[PDB]
Design a protein around this ligand. Structure first.
Ligand code: PQQ
Ligand code: PQQ
Ligand code: CL
Ligand code: CL
Lengths: 254, 254
């Protein structure tokens, strides 16, 4: 715990040290990186991760709704544009659907969200709900696991083509696009954290918030592990069919 | 799927049929029932389930906050009194603490919430956020997994003394108390469901909400399985110490 307020440089270093807990260290990621995941494991990952991807613009809109600073909103809205795109096959969500296709899944497989495991849903919804309820600065700074994301994107670009040659090359567009977007994102996110977190109290709080975000990512992979690596998807003792709920109940009727 | 609106009595039986997915069928539960769980697994279950127990009055208050019907609130508040304890008389939260002590955990072990796994936290928090956001009728009726709870409480009363004679007698107080409280609860819950769910659309939606609830229960046990049965708690590849966040970030500063 921080007793005496860290300088902004030292606080940055403390944020960066949290990368030790990033999901690049989860066995699910490591198995994919080393060429040991099966096609079903990769498909399940893409389908489930789509739920996180389609939640990012919701979460960013939530931050904006809580942010009375127009200068910040002018910057933050670019994240929504990056994922939703402007008119057509544009943006990140579309690029993730093309990754779905590149690994053998249809657009409907992803858009229906029917494969999204409840453990994935609850972790991702925790992010959204934090963004809706916390102060905008705290919610904005919980993005800063993006500090670690270019490394993990690059890892996939480096390892997947030779372990999984069946993944269509269009599939890699999204990862490539994030090497630059994540960096532009953190330029702002860091600047904001270093400016906002100017007391030991705020610094310790922010470190716990970043841990929360790390926990969301790890928990998504835990759910995937249980369903696709360990033969223990929900209700496996009672049925061989998917029986979990498949609806964003507070945002859609059905 | 219901196409033609079920009568109230037929709809009650469709709600009861969801018990096929209750967490009494989860292997974590079955292992405890069969005498194959470890003391660590029992302690972990007690410590993590305390997070659920201390969230029940929060989500019941959330329902009441959304409920402009005084008659309903007059009934619903009994749930809060049951868990929090009234006229200073101990309540269900205190009884769960005594279950903690009965399995060798201190009050501080439970109250600190330090042992609460992120996958448990996110599942439980999903319950509270649904209760906060959904219309009160939907939120109230999501309690109806209580239909299934007397059976599981009795299963523990029946089997744990044989297998785990070290669990102190005092620890069983909570389970015994719920045999009657759960029954009284669902009398009101069923009445509400049967009065409110008076179209096929509403009936199908309610069954999906009950599934969501079931998924929460199942996911809590999935997290416990990973951590206590499979040797894969969060960050196990990185550290042998607990590193997850331990704060209800939007309800407490630290
Ligand atoms: O592939 C990944 O491992 C990974 C991690 C993260 C992250 O660290 O939160 C994000 C992304 N991808 C992502 O694609 C992305 O667009 C993104 C936005 C955000 C954010 O919190 O606002 N994180 C991430
Ligand atoms: O031990 C259990 O298996 C179990 C399950 C559930 C349930 O089905 O949601 C409740 C409880 N216990 C419980 O102790 C409790 O007070 C309770 C209240 C509620 C509820 O949704 O409002 N569920 C449960
Ligand atoms: Cl990213
Ligand atoms: Cl109960």
């Amino acid at each position: 715990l921080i007793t005496d307020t860290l300088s902004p440089q030292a606080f940055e270093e403390a944020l960066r040290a949290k990368g030790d807990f990033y999901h690049i260290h989860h066995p699910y990621h490591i198995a994919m990186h080393n060429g040991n995941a099966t096609r079903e494991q990769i498909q399940g990952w893409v389908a489930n991760r789509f739920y996180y991807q389609t939640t990012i613009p919701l979460k960013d809109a939530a931050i904006m709704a809580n942010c009375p600073d127009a200068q910040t909103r002018r910057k933050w809205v670019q994240r929504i544009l990056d994922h939703d795109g402007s008119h057509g096959e544009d943006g990140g969500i579309e690029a993730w659907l093309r990754l779905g296709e590149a690994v053998g899944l249809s657009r409907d497989d992803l858009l229906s969200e029917r494969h999204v495991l409840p453990g994935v849903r609850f972790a991702v919804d925790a992010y959204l709900n934090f963004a809706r309820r916390a102060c905008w600065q705290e919610a904005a700074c919980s993005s800063l696991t993006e500090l670690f994301a270019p490394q993990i994107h690059q890892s996939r670009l480096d390892s997947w083509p030779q372990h999984y040659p069946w993944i269509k090359e269009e599939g890699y567009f999204f990862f490539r696009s994030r090497l630059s977007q994540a960096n532009r994102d953190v330029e702002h996110g860091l600047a904001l954290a270093k400016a906002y977190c100017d007391s030991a109290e705020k610094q310790n709080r922010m470190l716990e918030i970043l841990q929360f975000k790390l926990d969301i990512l790890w928990s998504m992979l835990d759910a995937m592990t249980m369903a696709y690596a360990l033969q223990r998807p929900p209700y496996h003792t009672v049925t061989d069919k998917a029986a979990w709920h498949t609806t964003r109940l507070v945002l859609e009727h059905h």
